[PDB]
Design a protein around this ligand. Structure first.
Ligand SMILES: Nc1nc2c(ncn2[C@@H]2O[C@H](COP(=O)(O)OP(=O)(O)OP(=O)(O)O)[C@@H](O)[C@H]2O)c(=O)[nH]1
Ligand SMILES: Nc1ncnc2c1ncn2[C@@H]1O[C@H](COP(=O)(O)OP(=O)(O)CP(=O)(O)O)[C@@H](O)[C@H]1O
Ligand SMILES: Nc1nc2c(ncn2[C@@H]2O[C@H](COP(=O)(O)OP(=O)(O)O)[C@@H](O)[C@H]2O)c(=O)[nH]1
Ligand SMILES: COc1cc(S(=O)(=O)Oc2ccc3[nH]c(C)cc3c2)cc(OC)c1OC
Ligand SMILES: [Ca+2]
Ligand SMILES: [Ca+2]
Ligand SMILES: [Ca+2]
Ligand SMILES: [Mg+2]
Ligand SMILES: [Mg+2]
Ligand SMILES: [Mg+2]
Lengths: 54, 344, 423, 438
């Protein structure tokens, strides 16, 4: 049981009590996968229109 | 109408319980993977406690207590009693045990050697026994070098073998008292009024491991006198109480059962703050099997606790009905055989 | 504003569609002239979903009336709410489809479909955010069956990112006009499998049985059958037409109700069945709602399993009690719901009840038992097609036997797909 | 003074953020028109509350917040609400059609059309910061916008603000108050793509909040307003250190330092006490020991789980009200004997404690009674992995039949992204087990 680092001020106070010691991708890579999804989306819509055209 | 699922096909106890629930006409059994259930008869290994008590408008009950493995495993039971202040290492009703890790693999290897060497110098009996949770592999040796070399060949424990056990006069054999304990969702400790004695069929010899291990399976294979004295090498309480009154001038309730009820309460009250489900989002009950051994001074010793016990053939009808009455129907009402061990 | 364009094709589609507009105009306080005369402002919060506001605070349905005959649409224009529809939105022919799918889809309807799409385009252009289209039609005739599916196919080509929704009336020998209804239905079903997001399967066999067995009507008329359709259509559009904390739209319904794109045929149900002064309790509404006798698809739910369920309760009631009864149904009959779609039952409550009822409940179920309906249609189709009976009515319009064989195969495949998810 | 920007995405983020800023104004004495009488430095100042509020020349205190939703209905309530005068229209961003509970529709299709606009509006607030700490992101796991667009936003924020922390307040899906059957799909997808971008995430399970409202507040059917007002109290306790003078968790970096030893294990479990119904005339004001003990009761946690069956890595005690350090230490010694608090061997068994003298503020006429002392505990427990296991099991049930997958593929997603997102979750459960082994 030990209280350490007691800081006080007007709005409150804080402290630490110890009980036992111990024993990113770039913007390019984002847009590549984003536009890849829009490409598959556009491919799937083209196939639908091709099916509808038939 | 209530719902329950089955996830332990090998459970001979809850196979009868599931039959009784369907026999009442107010319990419907579902598929093992259906989430909309009121009761779960879960499996032994890796029970999904994290998924229980999350269905809206469904009071869910499970037949196991999460965290009860600390009392039903060899290494954890010894570690529990030593560390728990309630039980303490000065516990008088538990044989002196030590946790031993294999050399191939904390550990208490040197601690076991210290107490062993004292007994040799003190002219006292220095017989010990080694076993583990992976048993059917048990070695009973008087020399410490034999036990440690056998463990090296999982986690094992070594405790003091009862060199002077209580032997029934008509046969000079060793018995093994099994008591069934049911703890419900309210953590009431119910002890079944009926117990069994897995007696041996061979005379105990101080100098072989047939007259030393009183298991029902071992006494059926290694022993040929199976059923010579009592049927199935299983003596019930009514017969064993009479023998005490005729050969020892005492009763089972006073000489033995008082200590048994004390050991049951002490173990279960110790782990109550860790497994209690009073404020939890789901409830738990569980049947336990306690194994005891009595010495010549009529003192009861605790061997181990079973989380998935098997009842005696005669007592299946009465015990499994009692499980439904006080553990299942108490939470799910429909349209005594226990001794309540009161506590705080 | 999430607007919906309504289209009604054929005799059945227009008669059922006209009743639908008659029912919901009353619920929103819109008189046959088109003026609002209600009390609650909740009647106008989402009035734009089905109505266009004209000059002088006039509300005109966003409806398009299509037929190859002038007869039924003349009845609608002379009906109770006939003066509410746009005169421009009456697109009709003169020859008719003759209860022939080929005439509606290939020969006679082809001559009229382009003019219909101009009205569809005119309505869609004036929408702030068009969410999709809903079509009312039967599958056993020629116009609503043949031309309706042609319209759906062409609408999808021009609006591929919009929701296609249909109220499709299935034929039945109990209420039958021609023997070639299984031919028309099987041809239409294949179209609906590919080109609709949600189809409310309204079975005339179910409607007849409800009128006969339940409502105790010896000789049910089409008006009696259409009364059940009006109650169902009002119920299944309650979340669209009235405000709630769900922000219901057609796309959200499709996403949650349809786990596999081809299995989008819903079983509608309604309670209480009406043709009357006693109020109905919440437990009674829930029990009747899941009862097979209140289903509009003539299928036994206990013969299959529910993939997804959407339930709508209407009236002033205890939402706490509604959740009690809905959970009771699921936890009781859990064997009739799939265990691999968690929380597959959705409940919404609307305070405004329908006209003449204090309490009502509407059921929308995607059950695999709907395969019985397609099995029934398929069996009636095969019995004639194996002998090529009445095929000359279709081959004379340019069709080939192979197209019927493909439709039969797609029909049986749909049954196979519904069957595999029942185990 | 170092500023913080709050970002509210989707319906849950906007409405919860609406409740939070309502509570912030009450706590700081800011009126619904942005006027703060207690503020003496007009148009400037580097005080503690300026980390969340900027000041105009006219003395109006404007939140440093951005509200984003792909549908206009929810944010229109903010535009016509009591605190409409707080924000300016640049902060409120709306689309026309929502994501329809589809992660792909909010991430790839509709999110891609609005991601640049949102970043621009965020940059408009970032340029008004002398030193920006990072972002507080409010969103739901279940919603298409709350899951799909947040993950896209978090990816871009890590690129444009790579040196800034990002904290999450995430609404875990619950059937009691739910909106979609595909929420398990969205929850797994958004956690996989945000795991490497979020420094610390506070999960709030709607099941826990629902039960607390029913149990403690005696609410028959809790509404979103009831849930959000309770949630804002937890959020206020967590962010009270950023908005008031203090020394514990004074900046966003300190949340990761004090609560996140392993970067992937950044989901602290929050427990709050006491929750007292205002309908009661006068309830017994609980003591410091009583509210501290309640922190170890599962019924008061924001995620239903069992901390007894899980090792601790860190623990914070954030008290608000009449609390002195002597009481806290006395309570802790009592609790350590009765409760089973097992830390990991590689961490010190200890408690970081912060006390704010100002008692918790409640909405006038609300359901939460005013109390003289409250505590919010932030404990990084491995027991929170139960929530991931529940979520992953529901994911596995639907995905075994590929149910509803076609809706995501139709927006450009690949079926392999589901398995990739799921395998990451399997690894996350493995990491939790490796730390909580006995
Ligand atoms: N606590 C709380 N949870 C909410 C609130 N609103 C929605 N949710 C939860 O959020 C989940 C759905 O996410 P939403 O925020 O509603 O959806 P969204 O982010 O707007 O995305 P869309 O699908 O485009 O509507 C559901 O599981 C709800 O339980 C709220 O106000 N408070
Ligand atoms: N310390 C000891 N002294 C004397 N006998 C002992 C002993 N420890 C074990 N035994 C004997 O060995 C037998 C088997 O030990 P134990 O009870 O651990 O076996 P097990 O784990 O197979 C029982 P269960 O079938 O309940 O799991 C006991 O029944 C008892 O006869
Ligand atoms: N429920 C209902 N079914 C109808 C109605 N009119 C026709 N039907 C059914 O629809 C089929 C006839 O289709 P019909 O609408 O007359 O063909 P169309 O006008 O050429 O599109 C038959 O199976 C009838 O049972 C109606 O008003 N209500
Ligand atoms: C337009 O019709 C409706 C739309 C909606 S929805 O927009 O909220 O979609 C959802 C959302 C979550 C869901 N969960 C399940 C199992 C289905 C489901 C549907 C709800 C309805 O009633 C419940 C409707 O009926 C009138
Ligand atoms: Ca012509
Ligand atoms: Ca200032
Ligand atoms: Ca980062
Ligand atoms: Mg044994
Ligand atoms: Mg006709
Ligand atoms: Mg939304």
């Amino acid at each position: 049981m030990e209280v350490i680092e007691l800081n006080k001020c007007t709005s409150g106070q804080s402290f630490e009590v110890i009980l036992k010691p111990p024993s990113d991708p770039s913007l390019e890579e984002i847009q590549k996968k984003l536009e890849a999804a829009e490409e598959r989306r556009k491919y799937q819509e083209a196939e639908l229109l091709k099916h509808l055209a038939e | 109408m209530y719902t329950f699922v089955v996830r332990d096909e090998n459970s001979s106890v809850y196979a009868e319980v599931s039959r009784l629930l369907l026999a009442t006409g107010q319990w419907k059994r579902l598929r093992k993977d259906n989430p909309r259930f009121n009761l779960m008869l879960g499996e032994r290994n890796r029970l999904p406690f994290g998924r229980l008590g999350h269905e809206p408008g469904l009071v869910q009950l499970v037949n196991y207590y999460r965290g009860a493995d600390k009392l039903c495993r060899k290494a954890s039971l010894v570690k529990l009693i030593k560390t728990s202040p309630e039980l303490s290492e000065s516990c008088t009703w538990f044989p002196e045990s030590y946790v031993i890790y294999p050399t191939n693999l904390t550990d208490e290897r040197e601690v076991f050697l210290a107490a062993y060497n004292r007994r040799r110098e003190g002219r006292e009996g220095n017989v010990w026994i080694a076993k583990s949770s992976a048993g059917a592999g048990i070695l009973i040796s008087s020399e410490a070098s034999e036990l440690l070399d056998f463990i090296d060949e999982q986690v094992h424990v070594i405790q003091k073998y009862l060199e002077k056990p209580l032997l029934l006069e008509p046969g000079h054999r060793k018995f093994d008292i099994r008591s069934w304990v049911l703890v419900d969702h309210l953590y009431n400790i119910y002890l079944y009024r009926e117990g069994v004695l897995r007696t041996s069929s061979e005379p105990y010899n101080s100098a072989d491991k047939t007259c030393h291990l009183t298991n029902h399976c071992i006494q059926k294979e290694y022993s040929k006198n199976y059923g010579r004295y009592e049927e199935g090498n299983e003596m019930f309480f009514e017969e064993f109480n009479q023998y005490l009154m005729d050969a020892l001038n005492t009763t089972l309730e006073n000489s033995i059962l008082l200590q048994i009820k004390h050991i049951i309460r002490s173990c279960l009250m110790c782990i109550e703050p860790a497994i209690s489900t009073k404020h939890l989002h789901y409830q738990s009950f569980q049947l336990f099997g306690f194994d005891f051994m009595v010495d010549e001074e009529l003192k009861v010793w605790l061997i181990e606790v079973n989380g998935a016990p098997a009842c005696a053939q005669k007592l299946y009808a009465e015990l499994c009905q009692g499980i439904v009455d006080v553990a299942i129907s108490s939470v799910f009402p429909l349209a005594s055989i226990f001794i309540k061990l009161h506590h705080h | 504003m999430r607007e919906i364009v309504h289209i009604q094709a054929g005799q059945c589609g227009n008669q059922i569609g006209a009743k639908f507009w008659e029912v919901i105009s009353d619920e929103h306080g819109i008189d046959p002239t088109g003026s609002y005369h209600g009390d609650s402002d909740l009647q106008l919060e989402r009035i734009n979903v089905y109505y266009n506001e004209a000059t002088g605070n006039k509300y005109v349905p966003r409806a398009i009336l299509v037929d190859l005959e002038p007869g039924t649409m003349d009845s609608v224009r002379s009906g109770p709410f006939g003066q509410i529809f746009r005169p421009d939105n009456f697109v009709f022919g003169q020859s008719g489809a003759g209860n022939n799918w080929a005439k509606g889809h290939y020969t006679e309807g082809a001559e009229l479909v382009d003019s219909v799409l101009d009205v569809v385009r005119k309505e869609s252009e004036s929408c702030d955010c068009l969410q999709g289209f809903q079509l009312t039609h039967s599958l056993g005739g020629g116009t609503g069956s043949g031309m309706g599916t042609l319209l759906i196919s062409k609408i999808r080509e021009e609006y591929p990112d919009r929701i296609m929704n249909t109220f499709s009336v299935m034929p039945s020998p109990k209420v039958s006009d021609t023997v070639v209804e299984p031919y028309n239905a099987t041809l239409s079903v294949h179209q609906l499998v590919e080109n609709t997001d949600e189809t409310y399967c309204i079975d005339n066999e179910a409607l007849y049985d409800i009128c006969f067995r339940t409502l105790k009507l010896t000789t049910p008329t089409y008006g009696d059958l259409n009364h059940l359709v009006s109650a169902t259509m009002s119920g299944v559009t309650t979340c669209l037409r009235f405000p709630g904390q769900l922000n219901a739209d057609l796309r959200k319904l499709a996403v949650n109700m349809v786990p596999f794109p081809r299995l989008h045929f819903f079983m509608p149900g309604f309670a209480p069945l009406t043709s009357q002064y006693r109020a109905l309790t919440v437990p009674e509404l829930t029990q009747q709602m899941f009862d097979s006798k209140n289903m509009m698809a003539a299928c036994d739910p206990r013969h299959g399993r529910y993939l997804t369920v959407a339930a709508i309760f209407r009236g002033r009631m205890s939402m706490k009690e509604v959740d009690e009864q809905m959970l009771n149904v699921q936890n009781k009959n859990s064997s009739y719901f799939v265990e691999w779609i968690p929380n597959n039952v959705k409940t919404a409550v609307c305070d405004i009840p329908p006209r003449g009822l204090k309490m009502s409940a509407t059921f929308i179920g995607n059950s695999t038992a709907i395969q019985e309906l397609f099995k029934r249609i398929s069996e009636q189709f095969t019995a004639m097609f194996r002998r090529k009976a009445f095929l000359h009515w279709y081959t004379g319009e340019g069709m080939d036997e192979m197209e019927f064989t493909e439709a039969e195969s797609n029909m049986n495949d749909l049954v196979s797909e519904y069957q595999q998810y029942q185990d | 003074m170092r500023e913080c920007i709050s970002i509210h995405v989707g319906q849950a983020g906007v409405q919860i953020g609406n409740a939070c800023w309502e509570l912030y104004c009450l706590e700081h004495g800011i009126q619904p028109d942005g006027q703060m009488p207690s503020d003496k430095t007009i148009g400037g100042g580097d005080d503690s509350f300026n980390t969340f509020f900027s000041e105009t020349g006219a003395g109006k205190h404007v939140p440093r917040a951005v509200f984003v939703d792909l549908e206009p209905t929810v944010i229109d309530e903010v535009r016509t609400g009591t605190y409409r005068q707080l924000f300016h229209p640049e902060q409120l961003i709306t689309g026309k059609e929502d994501a329809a509970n589809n992660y792909a529709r909010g991430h790839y299709t509709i999110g891609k059309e609005i991601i640049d606009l949102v970043l621009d509006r965020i940059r408009k607030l970032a340029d008004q910061c002398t030193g920006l700490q990072g972002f507080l992101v409010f969103h739901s796991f279940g919603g298409g916008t709350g899951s799909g667009f947040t993950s896209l936003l978090m990816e871009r924020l890590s690129v444009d603000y790579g040196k800034k922390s990002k904290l999450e307040f995430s609404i875990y899906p619950a059937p009691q108050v739910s909106t979609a059957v595909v929420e398990p799909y969205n929850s797994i997808l958004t956690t996989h793509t945000t795991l490497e971008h979020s420094d610390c995430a506070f999960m709030v399970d709607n099941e826990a909040i629902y039960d607390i409202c029913r149990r403690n507040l005696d609410i028959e059917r809790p509404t979103y307003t009831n849930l959000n007002r309770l949630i804002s109290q937890i959020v206020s306790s967590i962010t009270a250190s950023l908005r008031f003078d203090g020394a514990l968790n004074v900046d966003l970096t300190e949340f990761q330092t004090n609560l996140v030893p392993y970067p992937r294990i950044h989901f602290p479990l929050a427990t709050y006490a006491p929750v007292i119904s205002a309908e009661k005339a006068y309830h017994e004001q609980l003591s410091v020991a009583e509210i501290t003990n309640a922190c170890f009761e599962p019924a008061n946690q924001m995620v239903k789980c069992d901390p007894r069956h899980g090792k601790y890595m860190a623990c914070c005690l954030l008290y608000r009200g009449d609390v002195v350090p002597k009481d806290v230490n006395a309570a802790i010694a009592t609790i350590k004997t009765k409760r089973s608090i097992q830390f990991v061997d590689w961490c010190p068994t200890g408690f970081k404690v912060g006390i704010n003298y100002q008692p918790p503020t409640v909405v006038p006429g609300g359901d939460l009674a005013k109390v003289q002392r409250a505590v919010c505990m932030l404990s990084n427990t491995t027991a929170i992995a139960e929530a991931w296991a529940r979520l992953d099991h529901k994911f596995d049930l639907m995905y075994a039949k590929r149910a509803f997958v076609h809706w995501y593929v139709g927006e450009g997603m690949e079926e392999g992204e589901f398995s990739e997102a799921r395998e990451d979750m399997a690894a996350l459960e493995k990491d939790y087990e490796e730390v909580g082994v006995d």
